[PDB]
């Protein structure tokens, strides 16, 4: 062949040879299926907000020699092809401020509560970098999450990023909202160290359940101290992927002004799944499980965001709180691997303990807190070490409490002990317990209190012991909750008043 | 005495056999687990050679 | 002028069009070509470029050239609205599928439209007595919200669509809309007949029901359609109307398959397992326009088919979290004998609250659970390490999970001649004491075999007093 | 020479496409430094796209990118500082160092990717390293010059491991340390350099003797990926140029390779070899490779091996398996019984455990407590369905020797007082074993159990046995 032909395909399809003055302009030679092909926009930078024609904002994520790729912050069908585009000049930015509490914004930051508009301090940029090594501080200050199983075995600390994994239908948005109402104790108080302010996003999350998410925040008067960051899946995909570096960013504003919040990563799947449908239509080369590239890169770089900062930055905190959805309990794919590797602590909601009526089914064999004691009560600490060591045993001898064969005495005892406490760390949805109530049920289970009692009535246990520590002894609930430290005194004092309840029953 | 030592000699012999029971149903269950895991590197190949 | 088009590409469904004008229509738009036997219309996908833009064809491609003309109408899609389509079955591009006439519809709203606001969601935990036990016991389906089916093949997933059609359409009062999403045109003919039978279809009077029919006999782009067609009905019929919207989608997980079936010939990069990478957000904004708002409600009765029963997979999967009630029909158990086969534990629904269905029901349906999830845990023992070799208080609790089981199975009035027992139902507060009396040991000594195909505690005892009669 | 420059002409995500002209066309691997207003960013070349392209990868944030922006090219790979001042200041891929301390003025400036030593400077290593912890020292030696797995999981203490591995052999040894960032969380990270701070490794006023090179997760995955090459480079120039044993600290090979794996998914790289990265090979090699015992000094490299729910199907844990020498699992169930260092005695074994490496005693100390051990654990399941009572005289002793050694295997460590409160604890190997042989041989029979938990000698085992009684009573 005297002439081969070698060429493939070029994005140039009409030869103009003139025309200038492009650099801050384009047409649109494609776009379909929420993403768009434009010819131009030389001087514009990386996933750089876009304005077009039709109104439409859009985002470069790929930025090919022949045409820069938009994604739109929307429905395609206002956009065609040819459209005249122009920059924006500026990045994706999100108000934030205090003035977002007590409101449920969009996305982009557009309150889509209905009830006004927004109010902020300031605006802030979507793609914040993580604070440096440097200015941080070791996890110290404990976050009450309220349940007694999370609190005792598997502690959260201001700062600390605590991954909540589980099935689906398992309680991970419960435990996060139960968490969320746990902060109301010190979120009506004065002390803004204490005071936990709190953000949710919702991607991937439906629009009916954001409504009953924020209508039973309203009814525990929790709504006012969160600000809800919904991107529904009716929402265009490139909204959901933006919607969690949004709130992280609002977060950054509590942390960086010395105020402390804390951020839960409701549905990060969600967010994976559409950074996967934002790259293969972008046809960005596929990874593993048809994942997109830089997912890994994405989550870490919205996780290390939140963190606890440094005295000389205000000493602010922002607590991270990932949840994701396992596909039949498997976490060996990419998305439950990669995040497990990222945060700090990772929360193992399990359906089969769901099943067994654990509730909210905290998998303590297989959750993990790197944090540790080390941001916890010291009281909690206290408790929660002899806890962990029973439910351990427990573990390591369940499978002779499922033969219930003739077992030895102490194998017996620690089998009793360790059910009782699965059946003590059991709660209710939307029923947080504070430390002042919660160390006094773990002290009673730990020195073998509870062995009496029986399994079936360890929950009418746990209310007659509340309500006969608010009625009679609530000068020990009163120390508890204000010095954190279980002294000798303390110490005997509590046994006494469990020893006397397990006589009254 | 000599049918609780038959009883306990029977007891021996029936979780012997469902020892074998449960070494068996683990050696094939482990050599169906070994090529499901295999299939999942499969299919990682094939989606990897098909989208990329 | 109108807009004119001439088709450069045909591929399979994919039907590509080149308008020699700067006036291109929009996405989602309807484009219709004169066929020797009748109308093609295309709804625009992607733009792909050079004034040409890439289309899903609603009816098969029989004799496409290239160079045919296109006309573009302006819009979306449109059916007819309105209490017109009631009695009257509706084709993913409005023409009538039966030939009762043409539909006289005051309006035609288009297909595509934007889901209802969050401010706009009114929310709520009303109760539905469907009449089945295990549905109405262990995941109560909340009147208004958004109802799944999810089960396999041959598991009674139609069966259960019907029977719950029978049971709530003929008492709801209010509007419904029957929403056919690729299934088979046999199942959909049965349907009709049987709702015609019932006086729930009244040709020539007044129907409660409109039929909306994408049948799986029809292109991947219908399919992918009438699942928006029947969610327009629906939405017209909650918001106009002002009525409680009786949506029954059959067949959702059709609606994900041509999506991928599309996306393939679409030029989209396969997303895992094959599937479309824009799964979830199309089926996002199909399934957020179903809800509950100000205006009335749309109570969609969805039934997802699992492949190969794989609760893993994208597509359903997804569906589980974006959707209230779920009810798993698993293979597991429905060819164990209860071929109600509701997985008693991945069927769960938000309506599962004390301050919802009550202290006792929930009580009742957490020690239900208990007693299925110790079966299930010691399924193994049972099978080779001895049922006998276990402690009396488990085995007794087995026995109870067996009970349990065999009582979950309940006749069907659509499935008469299925399983052979006339199809009693079931009031919720009649389930919720005839199992809170069952988990208290009274019926212990009854032989398991009462339980089958049987209604309320009184079918039970009736059965049991039967078989000890005919065997003494 | 007229700097060598080109214009960007595509940035996807982390992947930057740099046009250059002709004849100016660089290497791959080489280093495509970008004047960013965000600091400085550099993009290392991967493959050649033709047309004078080349495909890189962003090795810090890919915020900013334009089309056409003026890019330099350094000559080559970016150059890491090198030296001894690099120790006690953190460094990253790109050189820059962010400790706001000032630049590093290092002695030399080497690329990250260098020639593996030849066949012939491949040698074995066979001498003992103290490392301070007595179940470490006596039952998996460690090996100078080496390769060192730390296995383990979530929650077990590997980080903490390393740290504490650092600080007592920094200690115990005047030889300088390097410790690799790869897949380092930020938090962990500011634990790390404040322990460091306070053990007095890091000392920033004066002399330190460990540098870390930590990899910041929240980069681009480019960083992640050489970051543990950087810290191999920091390793080799230490051991060749000085001449002095180095230690080598791997943060995470599994983040090393998830991260290569994730570059792979970047760039083309059609997944072939192990089947997430074709290239897997071909670095992982590399990198292994030039940890070796060279004439000019030896690079211990202890690098820590996480297993999600024991992922042994997959090929990773396997390609590290099939690497290291001796093995420290870090099982997290002995942690929660109460043995925090939770290494497993009988699953952590040393290629260099016999009797004419480590010594006869030793040897036959370590062999002697390991099968007490697995004896423990194999009748550990007939005491829990039986009782204590029937078992056997001698198998009551070996248990209760063997519950004795298991408490004895827990030992303070000095990087843990802000988590523990109880000082640290630097045993030495020789008292190590005579200490197990003493306990051993059932002359401390008598003293409690709980004596031997959390202590470090036998002088500190009856110091708490005296602490303890008198808590008592
Ligand atoms: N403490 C609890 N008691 C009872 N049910 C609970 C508790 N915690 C969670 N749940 C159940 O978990 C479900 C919430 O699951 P969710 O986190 O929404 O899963 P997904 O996010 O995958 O939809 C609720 O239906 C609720 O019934
Ligand atoms: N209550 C019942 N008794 C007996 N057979 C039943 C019952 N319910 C369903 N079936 C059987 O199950 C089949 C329904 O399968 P189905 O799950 O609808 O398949 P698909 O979901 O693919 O349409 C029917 O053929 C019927 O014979
Ligand atoms: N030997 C030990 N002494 C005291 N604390 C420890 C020890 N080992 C682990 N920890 C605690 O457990 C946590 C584990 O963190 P890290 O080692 O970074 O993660 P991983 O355990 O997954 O490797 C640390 O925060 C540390 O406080
Ligand atoms: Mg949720
Ligand atoms: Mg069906
Ligand atoms: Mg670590």
Known sequence: ????????????????????????????????????????????????????????????????????????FGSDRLVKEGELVKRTGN????????????????????????????????????????????????VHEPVQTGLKAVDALVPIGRGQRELIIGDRQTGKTAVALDTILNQKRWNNGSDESKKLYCVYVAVGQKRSTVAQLVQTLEQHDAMKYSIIVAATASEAAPLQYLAPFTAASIGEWFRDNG???????????????????????????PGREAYPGDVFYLHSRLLERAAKLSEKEGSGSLTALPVIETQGGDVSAYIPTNVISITDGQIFLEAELFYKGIRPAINVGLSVSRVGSAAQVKALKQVAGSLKLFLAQYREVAAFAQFGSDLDASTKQTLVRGERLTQLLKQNQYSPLATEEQVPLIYAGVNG????????????????????????????????????????????????????????? | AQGYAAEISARRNAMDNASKNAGDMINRYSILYNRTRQAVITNELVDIITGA | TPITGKVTAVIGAIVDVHFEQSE?????????????????????????????????????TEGLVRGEKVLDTGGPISVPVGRETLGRIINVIGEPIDERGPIKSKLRKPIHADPPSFAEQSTSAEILETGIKVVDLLAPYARGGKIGLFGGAGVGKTVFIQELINNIAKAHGGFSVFTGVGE??????????????????????????????????????????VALTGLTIAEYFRDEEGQDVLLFIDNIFRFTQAGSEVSALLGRIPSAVGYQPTLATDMGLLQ???????????????????????????????????????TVLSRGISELGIYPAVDPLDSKSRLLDAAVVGQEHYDVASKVQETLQTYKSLQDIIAILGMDELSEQDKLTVERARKIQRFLSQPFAVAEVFTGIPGKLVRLKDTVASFKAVLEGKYDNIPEHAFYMVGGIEDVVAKAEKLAAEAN
């Open chain 1, 1 to 72: 062949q005297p002439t081969e032909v070698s060429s493939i395909l070029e994005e140039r399809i009409k030869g103009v040879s003139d025309e200038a003055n492009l650099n801050e302009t384009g047409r649109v030679l494609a776009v379909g299926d929420g993403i768009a092909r434009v010819f131009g926009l030389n001087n514009i930078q990386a996933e750089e907000l876009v304005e077009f024609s039709s109104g439409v904002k859009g985002m470069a994520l790929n930025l090919e020699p022949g045409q820069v790729g938009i994604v739109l």
């Open chain 1, 91 to 138: 990045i994706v930015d999100v108000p934030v401020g205090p003035g977002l509490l007590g409101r449920v914004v969009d996305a982009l930051g557009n309150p889509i509560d209905g009830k006004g508009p927004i109010d902020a301090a300031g605006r802030s940029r979507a793609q914040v970098k993580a604070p440096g090594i440097l200015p941080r501080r070791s």
């Open chain 1, 259 to 285: 105020k402390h919040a804390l951020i839960v990563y409701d549905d990060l799947s969600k967010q994976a799944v559409a950074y996967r449908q934002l790259s293969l239509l972008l046809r960005r080369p």
């Open chain 1, 449 to 505: 209190h509870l062995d009496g009692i029986e399994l079936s009535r360890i929950g009418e246990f746990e209310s007659s012991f509340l309500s006969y520590l608010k009625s009679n002894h609530n000068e020990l609930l009163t120390e508890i909750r204000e010095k954190g430290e279980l002294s000798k005194e303390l110490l005997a004092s509590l046994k006494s008043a469990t020893e006397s309840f397990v006589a009254t029953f």
């Open chain 3, 24 to 60: 291109l229509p929009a996405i989602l738009n309807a484009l219709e070509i004169k066929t020797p036997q009748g109308k093609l219309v295309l709804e625009v996908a992607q733009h792909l470029g050079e004034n040409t833009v890439r289309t899903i064809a609603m009816d098969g």
């Open chain 3, 184 to 225: 088979r045109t046999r199942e959909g003919n049965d349907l009709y007949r049987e709702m015609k039978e019932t006086g729930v279809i009244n040709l020539e009077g007044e129907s409660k029901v409109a039929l909306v029919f994408g049948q799986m006999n029809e292109p991947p782009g219908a399919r992918a359609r």
């Open chain 3, 288 to 326: 957020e326009r179903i809800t509950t708002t100000k205006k009335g409600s749309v109570t969609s009765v969805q039934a997802v088919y699992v492949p190969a029963d794989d609760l893993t997979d994208p597509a359903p999967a997804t569906t589980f979290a974006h959707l209230d009630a779920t």
